[PDB]
Design a protein around this ligand. Structure first.
Ligand SMILES: OC[C@H]1O[C@H](O[C@H]2[C@H](O)[C@@H](O)[C@@H](OC[C@H]3O[C@H](O[C@H]4[C@H](O)[C@@H](O)[C@H](O)O[C@@H]4CO)[C@H](O)[C@@H](O)[C@@H]3O[C@H]3O[C@H](CO)[C@@H](O)[C@H](O)[C@H]3O)O[C@@H]2CO)[C@H](O)[C@@H](O)[C@@H]1O
Ligand SMILES: OC[C@H]1O[C@H](O[C@H]2[C@H](O)[C@@H](O)[C@@H](O[C@H]3[C@H](O)[C@@H](O)[C@@H](O)O[C@@H]3CO)O[C@@H]2CO)[C@H](O)[C@@H](O)[C@@H]1O
Ligand SMILES: [Ca+2]
Ligand SMILES: [Mn+2]
Length: 620
């Protein structure tokens, strides 16, 4: 028996319920099967081998196979608690706003019979029949991740509609989709970082069997699914907060929070029960939904070290935090030894290297770390390469330039937390004579240039929905993310508010040229190990204040030189080619004779070229 809702795989008429709650006096289960009455038949047993090891349990018999039943734990005659480990809840405040087209035949809340969120159990639930048997998840260091917010990716905000986008995403060339948080969050409209029931699937994105269908369809196409998951904190509607209240006596939480950038109730990751709950949650999402791994939101928050409001002190090497993340990783990898462990960390490099290295001596991939290059790419595509406050240096895109021995950094130009590059170019872009980065066609060309200096570099990569169509700025500047330092127009939505959905951008040939350029770069990357391999030898000229930029890659199967003009006027850019001879322009189909490794190439502002040391075809 574990805490939560324990089905009997051989008896669909019963369930065993178990709650961890030291310090309580008595518990009744109330629910549909008690007619929401307090009944002595539903008085829970107290199992208390030690005062800090108290579990309340009962076996409920005589249920109808396949029927849903709402229930709560009614504790001490004063607290009505939905199970911490519920996989579905009914929310009386927000469920009325979920269309039947989003969640067909949604069980009505027991209005007037109880109050607060209720848990749902369903013995003998019909089982989704998984179709894909032989899916091989991409190597962790080869991930090309599409970060997706279901709320703002499709107007219907649901799993069944996501399935209809997979031809578009597969053609773009990503090999993983990262869903922003799908676990039950307060309300319906959210980015998802207000989790209430961390093992329940939020019903506003549709039923669980539709997420299973989505994962199965991704797997059919060779695409992994990563879940963004939020374990730093819990809202006031979490049973971790409600069981003892937001009080000094609640051992699960920290008030005040132990570190900066906390929201809601900071959790105590040193508490053995929080470790149990975390492990249960990671195991559940892997086992039930067959997802390929997790992006751990605010993993730097997994510590009891007190740094108050000191971000520098928080980001410093924290041995306690490293222990807790290795402990969590051991439990994940005991469930599934190749599950992705992705940290949204932003700790000092000493700590990040140690987390990346963990398990590699035992055949594990190590942990992957978010690597934010939004500001450096922003400066680079805006055409401001000499700002003393905002570096344009892209050198650290390659893992060895960040001091890492292995490709465990997920670089991104964009994430849901960062400004759109297209906003920055259209809002602030540089100009010289006739060349204006604020002009939409010029800005789209600079995103092609940015892609050529991003998708070509070994190690995993992430892109944020619709960057490939030039999302940002929009009609008048409304496509602007608040809270990045930029003063968004008055017409922009709030940072966390719904953003415009613009699939009509597929009908703009200029925006589709950007999509097709990124798709062609990702096809090159898929087809040629040079772009992906930890054995690739990399040289680069991506420094701050250098407009004439280049990357060289050498590998046994292919050598590559990427050249780009991040300036505002025509420029001769002189890469060091790794070998003399004839090189082949992949996009333009022409040749380049290199008889001096230092060969100058005149480029228009915003232009890139990609050369290979042998003919490998042409962009379509
Ligand atoms: O209540 C009405 C509002 O509800 C919704 O808003 C939600 C929001 O969608 C949800 O994410 C959550 O916001 C918390 C913070 O989320 C983000 O930060 C996370 C990062 O994006 C993520 O990458 C990282 O891993 O984790 C971060 C959280 O630790 C935003 O960047 C923050 O701005 C959000 O904070 C805001 O809310 C908090 C707490 O309420 C507030 O203290 C903070 O100062 C704010 O800055 O919770 C929100 C509800 O509170 C809906 O989306 C809104 O449109 C609606 O008005
Ligand atoms: O005024 C001359 C000024 O030009 C250049 O500065 C540019 C910045 O480099 C660039 O980031 C952008 O600044 C915006 C920030 O990105 C944004 O986050 C917010 O802070 O608003 C800024 C615009 O006000 O654009 C400016 C040019 O306007 C150059 O690099 C500077 O050295 C120089 O002083
Ligand atoms: Ca919800
Ligand atoms: Mn924390």
């Amino acid at each position: 028996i574990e805490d939560g809702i324990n089905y009997d795989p051989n008896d669909p008429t019963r369930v065993t319920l178990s709650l961890y709650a030291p310090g309580k006096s008595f518990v009744y289960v109330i629910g549909d099967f008690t007619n929401w009455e307090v009944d002595p038949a539903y008085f829970m047993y107290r199992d208390a081998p030690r005062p800090d090891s108290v579990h309340w349990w009962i076996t409920i018999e005589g249920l109808t196979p396949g029927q849903e039943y709402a229930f709560q734990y009614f504790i001490d005659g004063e607290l009505r608690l939905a199970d911490l480990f519920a996989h579905k809840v009914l929310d009386p405040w927000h469920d009325p706003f979920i269309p039947s087209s989003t969640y067909p035949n949604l069980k009505p809340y027991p209005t007037g019979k109880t109050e607060g969120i209720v848990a749902v159990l369903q013995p003998g639930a019909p089982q989704y029949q998984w179709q894909v048997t032989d899916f091989e998840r991409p190597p962790a260091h080869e991930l090309v991740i599409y970060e997706l917010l279901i709320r703002d990716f499709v107007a219907r905000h649901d799993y069944v509609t996501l399935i209809d986008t997979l031809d578009y995403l597969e053609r773009l060339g990503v090999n993983a989709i990262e869903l922003m948080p799908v676990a039950e969050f307060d309300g319906n409209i959210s980015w998802g970082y207000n989790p209430a029931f961390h093992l329940a699937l939020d019903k506003y994105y549709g039923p669980a069997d539709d997420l299973k269908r989505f994962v199965d369809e991704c797997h059919r196409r060779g695409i992994a699914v990563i879940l963004d998951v939020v374990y730093n904190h819990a809202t006031g509607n979490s049973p971790l907060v409600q069981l003892y209240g937001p009080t000094a006596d609640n051992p699960f939480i920290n008030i005040p929070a132990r570190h900066p950038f906390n929201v809601f109730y900071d959790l105590n990751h040193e508490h053995p029960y929080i470790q149990y709950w975390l492990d249960r949650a990671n195991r559940y999402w892997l086992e039930e939904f067959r997802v390929d791994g997790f992006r751990f939101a605010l993993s730097k928050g997994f510590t009891q070290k007190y740094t108050d409001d000191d971000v520098g002190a928080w980001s410093a090497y924290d041995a306690s935090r490293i222990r807790l993340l290795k402990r969590m990783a051991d439990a994940i990898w005991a469930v599934d030894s190749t599950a992705y462990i992705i940290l949204e960390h932003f700790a000092d490099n000493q700590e990040e290297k140690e987390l990346a290295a963990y398990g590699q001596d035992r055949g594990r991939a190590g942990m992957l770390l978010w690597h934010n290059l939004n500001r450096a790419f922003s400066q680079s595509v805006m055409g401001y390469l000499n700002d003393p406050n905002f570096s344009s240096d892209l050198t650290t895109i390659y893992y060895k330039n960040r001091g890492f021995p292995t490709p465990n950094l997920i670089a991104y130009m964009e994430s849901h937390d960062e400004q759109w590059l297209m906003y920055r170019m259209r809002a602030y872009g540089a100009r010289q004579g006739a060349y204006d980065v604020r002009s939409l066609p010029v800005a789209l060309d600079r995103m092609k240039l940015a892609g050529a200096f991003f998708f070509t570099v070994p190690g995993p990569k992430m892109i944020w929905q619709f960057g490939e169509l030039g999302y940002g700025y929009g009609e008048r500047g409304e496509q602007c993310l608040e809270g990045t330092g930029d003063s968004c127009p008055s017409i922009a939505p709030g940072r966390i508010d719904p953003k415009p959905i613009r699939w009509d951008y597929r009908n703009d040939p200029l925006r589709m040229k950007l999509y097709r350029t990124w798709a062609e770069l990702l096809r090159l990357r898929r087809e040629h190990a040079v772009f992906r391999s930890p054995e690739t030898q990399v040289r680069m000229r991506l420094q701050h204040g250098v407009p004439g930029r280049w990357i060289s890659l050498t590998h046994p199967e292919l050598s590559v030189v990427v050249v780009g003009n991040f300036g505002l006027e025509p420029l001769v850019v002189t890469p060091t080619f790794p070998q003399t001879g004839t090189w082949y322009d992949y996009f333009n189909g022409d040749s380049l004779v290199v008889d001096d490794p230092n060969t100058g190439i005149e480029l228009l502002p915003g232009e890139f070229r990609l050369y290979t040391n042998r003919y490998v075809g042409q962009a379509e």
